[PDB]
Each structure stands twice: as C-alpha cells, then as structure tokens.
Structure 1
Amino acid sequence: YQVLARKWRPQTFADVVGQEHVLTALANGLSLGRIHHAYLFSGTRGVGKTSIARLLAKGLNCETGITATPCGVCDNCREIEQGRFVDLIEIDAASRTKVEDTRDLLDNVQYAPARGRFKVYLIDEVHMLSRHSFNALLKTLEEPPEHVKFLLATTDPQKLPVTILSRCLQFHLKALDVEQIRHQLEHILNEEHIAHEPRALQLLARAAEGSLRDALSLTDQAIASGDGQVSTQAVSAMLGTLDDDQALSLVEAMVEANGERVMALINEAAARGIEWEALLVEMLGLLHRIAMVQLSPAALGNDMAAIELRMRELARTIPPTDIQLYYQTLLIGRKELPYAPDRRMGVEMTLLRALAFHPR
C-alpha cells in the first residue's frame, strides 16, 4: 500500500491542479523552441514543484520529440516514472552538501547523454547548499553545454545567492485555494471508492491551509480513524471543531471582565478536551465579525443567525478600539502559545492579560 500523496502524483500536465500560468509558460516555451538551461521553481510547501520538474524532464526527454504533452508510454517516460533513467540525475542538496560532490558533478558535464538527448540535473531542496557549492555552480549555470539542462526546486528562494537567482528562470507557484483542494479530494475519493460528505471535505480543505499534501495527510488520518469513511463527525473530532457557543460565551465573559466565569469556562473546556488554537481562532473570527458589524450593520452573515442578536449587543457596547485591542491580544497569545510551559497555561495567561486590559 502506498499513501495517497505518494500514489496520486501527477503524471501529465492535465493532472496538475492549478498553477495555470506556469504550465502555460512552459508549453509556450516548448512549442516555440525557446528552452532555457536553468529553471527555478519557488513556492510554498506541497504545490507540485517536484512534480512539475519531473513532468518537464519527461517532456524534454521523450522519444517522440520535445513536446509539452509527454506520451507517458515510451521507454524514456516509463523509466523516468520508475526512477531508473540514467540521463536524469536527481540530486538531494541536503544529504550531499559538501563542495567535493558539486565539484565532481561539474566535472561530468562534458560527456554526451547515454540514451536521451538532454542531460537533466534535477536539484531538489537547493537552498541547503554551502556558499562554496553555489559559487562552483555559478559559471556552469551561466554557460553550460548544449546537451545539459538544470532544474532547481526550492521552498525558500530568499536563502540563495542573488547571482544564482539571476542566472535562472524563476517560476513562482501559488498556494491552492479551498475550492481546488476540495475538488481534488472529491475526485480522489471517488476514484478510490470511499464514502464522504460535503462538510468533511470542506473542513479538510479549510484545514489544509493551501497545501495539497497536508490535505491528503489529513484525509488519510480520517480514513484510518474513520473506519474507512470520511464522515463529518470523524473530521470534526480529529480537528477539534468547536460547535457550541463556548467561544461566544468566553468573549462575552472577557468583555464583561468577569474573571470567575472565564476561569470556570476554561476549566470546563479543559475537562471536556478542546484544541486551544481552534478556540483562539474562533474567538478572533468572532471579534472580526463584531468589528465588521460595527462598520456596517449588514455585515453580519446569515450563517451566525442563532447568535445574531447577542452579537449585535456587543457591537452596541464595545468601542471599536477595545475590540482591536482584544483582537491583537488574542493574536499575540496565539503566536506565543507554542512557546509556553503548557498550552492551557498560555491560554490562561492570555485571557488574564485581556481581562486586565479593561480601559473603562
């Protein structure tokens, strides 16, 4: 068994979710015969940098010809997919950082390709190379031989030397939106014949934070813990999704400066067992909604109708500056929550500071 993130790797440009601009640029370059000798794909975590690089290599080294739509059936494509293609050399740039490795690699750039037409050096995680390695690379990257192509993939482009960036064609990937992630998850689950519900997929997409690998990992967690079913209850339990009015009650108690009730609610929540970061995020969202309502009475969305009245009351009592102050205090508490002796201690300290902030 192979995990979903390792089984559903794209094999053609038609299978790539989003990143339309990069694919269009690559297709135009291949069609017009304007292939460059240095490509640097920079993006966030899990946005298909390695997949795009591998597909570009397949297109460059396809038997039929240089095409933007590799066949995927010729021997070159099959060997590249399997990973035992001689002319495609994939460096790690994390297990091989010393200058000797780079220097000996740069001494093998003269020999012609064994089987293919281009010698493709795919350097992944290139941001973990020493300065000497970059300096050695520079001149070869500037004017390499005709039969050699360099592909670079990094998640931290600002750690590279400026010259390295200037010597390469940069493609900046964009984080996938919620709808695209949800659609991809639905398609994958349909192909795999796994039950699912719209709410579960929506929650998983929202929690993915724009990374598809994270979405697939969460889906695998749900499948393992959901008895082979992606149900709303299982996803909510895994993600600790607040459902009742704990956030609103805590916000009201904090505004009223009733420390006793705040501490009682904190103790009750701890006894129940709740993810503190989710609670802080919900409180921040409620504060933002109250501020929006203060800006305009119609900002309140229908979704939070059950508490609308209560929300409006706060909008009629809390000055906007106090709302901003509470929002920033909760944000700071969220930032420092990992670096605390305990998560509950951090939450309590943040809420006590907010209680002490009463300017009236």
Structure 2
Amino acid sequence: GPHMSYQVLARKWRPQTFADVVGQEHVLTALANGLSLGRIHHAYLFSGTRGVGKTSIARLLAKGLNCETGITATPCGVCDNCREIEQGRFVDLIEIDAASRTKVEDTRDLLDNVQYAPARGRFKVYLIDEVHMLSRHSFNALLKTLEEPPEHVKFLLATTDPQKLPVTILSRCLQFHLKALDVEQIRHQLEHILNEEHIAHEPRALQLLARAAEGSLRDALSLTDQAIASGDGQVSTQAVSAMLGTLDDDQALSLVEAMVEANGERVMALINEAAARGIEWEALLVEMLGLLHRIAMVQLSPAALGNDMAAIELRMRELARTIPPTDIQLYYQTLLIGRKELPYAPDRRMGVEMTLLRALAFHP
C-alpha cells in the first residue's frame, strides 16, 4: 500500500470525513443535525468502547468546527486550516493526552490558554483524550472553565470509562455513547480496507478476524496486520485460523463443550493447548466452574446472561437449552471435588486431567 508497507493499517486507515466512519450512525447523525441547525452544546463528551472511533469522531468534529467554510457536518478537502488537523499541526486545535497530563498544573496551562483568542479557526477546540484520568483538581478546573466558557471555545472529551467522570462534568457535557461495532460492520470495513490495500484475502478469514475482534475495529485492524505478517502479503484462511488458535485463550468453554459432549480426544487436546499456553490450572477449573454455574442460571431464567459475556452468548444458549440440569449438576459437583483435591496430585496438570476424566466417565 504505502511507500514500503511499514505504515500501520490502524493509523493509516483513520476516517478523514464523516462518511468514512463505520456505522456509529447515532452520534454521526446527531452531531450532523446539531452542526447544521446551529444547536451547539459547550462540551461534547464522547465515550463507548476502545477502538470504536471516539477519538476519530472527536477529531472529525474538531475539523468540522474549525473549518473556514463554516460550521459544517462535512469538513472539506483542502481548506488549509481544515487540513492542518490531519497533516502537520493546527494551532487552535489543542490535543491533550489527559492520561499523560493528568496534573492540575498541566491542565492549568491550557485552561489559561482558553481565554486567549484562537489564531486561525473560529473555535479554540480542545480534544482531551482519556479524560477520566484527570485528577480531582484537574476536574475541578475543567468544570470551572465549563461553567462559563467563551463563545470561541469548545471541549471534546473522549474516554472509555465515563463512570470516573464527576456528575458535575457529565451534566455540562452532552455525552455521545458509541456502541461496540457489530461483526458485520467490522467484517465489511476490513474487506474494504484489504481490497483498497491490494491485499489478497479469503472471505472466511475476515469473519474469523471480526469474531476475534470482540467488537473493536482497531483490534480487527491489528489482527489483520498480524495475519499479513503470518504469511507473505496474503490473508489466507488457514494462516488466520492458526494465528487465532495460537492467540486463543478460551479454553474453559471449549473444555466444557467437549466434556459435556463426551469427546475424550478433544478434551485431551484442549488440555494440551492449555498446558502449552502456560495457563494456570486452578484458574482453568475456576473458569469451568463459573461457566457451568452460569449455564445453570441461564437454564433457570434467560435474563441471567449479562452484557459482560456478549462474546459467548450463543454457545451458552446452546449449552443451556440442550443439556438437562441433572448433567450440569453432576459436572459441577465433579469439578468442585476435583478442584478441592487439585493441590494433592502428582501435578496440577494431572489433577485437572483426572477431574475431567471423571466428569467424562460419569456419562449421565
């Protein structure tokens, strides 16, 4: 793609217009309507998940704010000021890594920069990434500035855990929540990126990568660059699947699936995988116990599946609907007994293997 392929797909591929953003349609539509209608809030807090675009959206909104063509939902192409945000630096757009500059003094300097006029753009736009890491006093200063901000100053805050922001900051910020990307959106964007990179790709590898991304597009892009690494400039399904298996840590769920199914060779293969990964064995037993307990609770009531396990919903459903509660009870008891007797074993590996052997031998 680029002048020698060192340039990372994650950073080279970053939206430059609102249309290049993958379907975070909620915030994009609301912000476009606000910009076009003139309804502007003092602060625009952005949040959501890692690698779903909150910093990209904030940068594009700053470009739209400070573009010389006017407050537009569509920043233009050349517009030298509107270009300075991407290539080079823009004077009036202040990008702060609030994680690097959490101190009230570092933010004090910029909040004293607030009252000075913008050089070129209309608005002294502030992009404060990882806003949740500012100290209590930095938050106090930011709030004090947010009470009465001048008409030439707007704040753009991005974070992953808004719960650490004070309610006083949240009341003055119109938070825009970004939802984790779907597998279809991630797969389609990866397909487009690889097609425009002239990279040979197999359709199934993209779905595997998207499923492995866990909803974050940047995870998909990093896994994609790594998959190109594992190979010679081609994203082959076999190479991608082998890489994913190497990176795989979902051993306990597969172990429960294979043990309930009574698949001894698959169980032993999964135990070999968990051994080669240097995975703790007591942790493996605890994960299997938790999975079985959750399966039982789902069998009692479908609402037992929270949003903490959205990656493994379907499998859980499949295991809860098809396995009677008696077998789950027996397996939970067997694994509890095995974990109780794990310390007194030839080694943890043999203890876990024997506990799973007992669970298989039950065949209930």
Does the pair score TM above 0.5?
A: yes
Equivalent position to 2:284, from 279, 292, 307? 279
Equivalent position to 2:63, from 37, 50, 58? 58
Asked if the contact 2:214–2:311 (Cα under 8 Å) also holds between the matched residues in 1, the reply is: no
d(CA) in 1 for partners of 2:217, 2:309: 29
What's the RMSD between the two structures over aligned residues?
Answer: 7.0
Distance of aligned partners of 1:145 and 1:176 in 2 relative to their CA distance in 1, 3 Å threshold: same
Asked if the contact 2:130–2:158 (Cα under 8 Å) also holds between the matched residues in 1, the reply is: yes
Asked if the contact 2:63–2:82 (Cα under 8 Å) also holds between the matched residues in 1, the reply is: yes
Distance of aligned partners of 1:340 and 1:189 in 2 relative to their CA distance in 1, 3 Å threshold: farther
User: What's the offset of the Cα at 1:107?
Assistant: 1.9
Cα shift readout 1:336-360 (whole Å, capped 9, x = no counterpart): 999999996896597479679999x
Cα shift readout 1:82-121 (whole Å, capped 9, x = no counterpart): 2411000111111112111222222222221111111001
Asked if the contact 1:242–1:278 (Cα under 8 Å) also holds between the matched residues in 2, the reply is: no
Look up the SS of the partner of 2:180 in the other structure.
coil
Asked if the contact 1:240–1:274 (Cα under 8 Å) also holds between the matched residues in 2, the reply is: no
Distance of aligned partners of 1:200 and 1:292 in 2 relative to their CA distance in 1, 3 Å threshold: farther
Distance of aligned partners of 1:5 and 1:350 in 2 relative to their CA distance in 1, 3 Å threshold: farther
Distance of aligned partners of 1:351 and 1:84 in 2 relative to their CA distance in 1, 3 Å threshold: same
Q: TM-score, normalised by structure 1?
A: 0.77
d(CA) in 1 for partners of 2:309, 2:160: 38
More divergent stretch after superposition (179-188 vs 79-88): 79-88
d(CA) in 2 for partners of 1:233, 1:96: 44
More divergent stretch after superposition (96-105 vs 37-46): 96-105
User: What's the offset of the Cα at 1:303?
Assistant: 27
Distance of aligned partners of 1:301 and 1:32 in 2 relative to their CA distance in 1, 3 Å threshold: closer
Distance of aligned partners of 1:302 and 1:38 in 2 relative to their CA distance in 1, 3 Å threshold: closer
The residue that corresponds to 2:356 in the other structure is 351
Q: TM-score, normalised by structure 2?
A: 0.76
User: What's the offset of the Cα at 1:322?
Assistant: 2.9
d(CA) in 2 for partners of 1:228, 1:191: 14
d(CA) in 2 for partners of 1:99, 1:129: 8
Distance of aligned partners of 1:105 and 1:199 in 2 relative to their CA distance in 1, 3 Å threshold: same
User: What's the offset of the Cα at 1:64?
Assistant: 1.1
The residue that corresponds to 1:37 in the other structure is 42
User: What's the offset of the Cα at 1:319?
Assistant: 3.2
d(CA) in 2 for partners of 1:23, 1:285: 39
Look up the SS of the partner of 2:343 in the other structure.
coil
Cα shift readout 1:212-247 (whole Å, capped 9, x = no counterpart): 100011111110111111111101110118999999
d(CA) in 1 for partners of 2:340, 2:175: 32
Look up the SS of the partner of 2:86 in the other structure.
helix
Which blocks of at least 5 consecutive residues in structure 2 are unaligned? 1-5
User: What's the offset of the Cα at 1:80?
Assistant: 1.0
Structure 1 segment 149-168 matched on structure 2, within 5 A = 149-168=154-173
d(CA) in 2 for partners of 1:163, 1:351: 53
Look up the SS of the partner of 1:350 in the other structure.
helix
User: What's the offset of the Cα at 1:260?
Assistant: 11
Asked if the contact 1:254–1:355 (Cα under 8 Å) also holds between the matched residues in 2, the reply is: yes
Which blocks of at least 5 consecutive residues in structure 1 are unaligned? none
d(CA) in 1 for partners of 2:109, 2:269: 66
Distance of aligned partners of 1:182 and 1:275 in 2 relative to their CA distance in 1, 3 Å threshold: farther
User: What's the offset of the Cα at 1:312?
Assistant: 16
